[PDB]
């Protein structure tokens, strides 16, 4: 059923599973019309579909043209997400298809369940974890490819870069969730921590800087400080 702190090592077992986050699918700017009314303008979005064991990220870019002439876009976005996830699964060889799909928001359960009725052996589950995947658009290279897209497009990334050569998938997922929580809590300070030192660079084929093991422990500590503080500056404590 629902996924929570009690069954957390399950993410890193050998059953293929994907997280789906739909928070960046339908994105808008809200603005005033010439007549003084309010209107929305959509901007490109993305589905964040992530294998937490391997780091494989299937980033389906959602071009604004998919909304042209449609009503109830927030509702449509959930069904569009489910259609794209279904299509992704159907495109995979059987031995690569997930045994579970975990949605980060419960409103995605019925749309995904309906689109996957053809796959009765794939479990569709919610989670009680508050995962910071909405911050994926604070990662510069991901934001860049989403905003430059002129058509619907799927782009593949490893969100762990080369980390699994040195750490476990449990540790990599913890590092990712820490980084994304920090970016969600205070994007500016978070991004200052990650690039403060000009000698540490991001490889052309990576998303994050090439920190040594030691530098990562420092970085991780600085992200913890940020999250504890900003929570300070937030609750006054």
Q: 68 or 117, CB closer to other proteins? A: 117
Considering only 111, 122, 142, 208, the residue that binds other proteins (CB under 8 A) is: 111
CA distance 200 to 137: 22
Residue from 155, 108, 112, 145 nearest 127 by CA: 108
Question: Does 76 participate in binding other proteins (rule CB under 8 A)?
Answer: yes
Tell me how far apart the alpha carbons of residues 72 and 222 are, in angstroms, rounded to a whole number. 42
Q: Which of the stretches 98-106, 114-122, 165-173, 180-188 binds other proteins when contact is defined by CB under 8 A?
A: 114-122
Residue 44 vs 86, nearer CB to other proteins = 86
Binding-site size for other proteins (CB under 8 A) equals: 11
Specify the DSSP element, H or E, that contains 30.
Answer: strand 27-32
In the set 53, 60, 115, 175, which binds other proteins (CB under 8 A)? 115
Please tell me whether residue 79 binds other proteins under the rule CB under 8 A: yes
Rounded to an integer, what distance in angstroms lies between the CA atom of residue 7 and that of residue 101? 15
Alpha carbon 161 to its chain's center: 15
Q: Which stretch binds other proteins (CB under 8 A): 51-59, 88-96, 109-117, 140-148?
A: 109-117
Closest to 84 (Cα-Cα) out of 109, 64, 107, 58: 58
Do residues 3 and 129 touch, judged by C-beta distance below 8 A? Answer: yes
Answer for which of 110, 128, 144, 225 binds other proteins (CB under 8 A) is 110
Q: Does 118 bind other proteins (CB under 8 A)?
A: yes
Using CB under 8 A, list all residues that contact other proteins: 76, 79, 82-83, 110-111, 113-115, 117-118
């Amino acid at each position: 059923g629902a996924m929570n702190s009690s069954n957390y090592a399950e993410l890193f077992n050998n059953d293929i599973k994907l997280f789906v986050d739909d928070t960046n699918v339908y994105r808008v700017t809200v603005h005033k019309t010439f007549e003084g009314n309010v209107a929305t303008k959509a901007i490109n979005g993305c589905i964040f579909t992530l294998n937490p064991k391997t780091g494989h990220l299937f980033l389906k870019i959602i071009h604004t043209s998919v909304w042209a002439g449609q009503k109830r876009l927030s509702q449509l976005a959930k069904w569009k997400t489910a259609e794209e996830v279904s299509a992704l699964v159907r495109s995979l060889p059987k031995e690569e298809q997930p045994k579970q799909i975990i949605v980060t928001r419960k409103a995605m359960l019925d749309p995904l369940e309906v689109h996957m009725l053809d796959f009765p052996n794939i479990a569709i589950r919610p989670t009680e974890l508050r995962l910071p995947f909405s911050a994926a658009m604070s990662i510069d290279k991901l934001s860049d490819v989403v905003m430059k897209a002129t058509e619907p497009q799927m782009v593949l990334f490893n969100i762990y870069d080369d980390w699994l050569d040195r750490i476990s998938s449990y540790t990599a997922f913890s590092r990712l969730t820490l980084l994304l929580r920090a970016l969600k809590t205070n994007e500016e300070s978070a991004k200052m921590i990650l690039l403060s030192d000009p000698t540490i660079t991001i490889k052309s084929y990576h998303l994050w800087p090439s920190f040594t093991d030691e530098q990562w422990i420092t970085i991780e500590s600085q992200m913890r400080d940020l999250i504890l503080t900003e929570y300070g500056r937030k609750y006054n404590v």
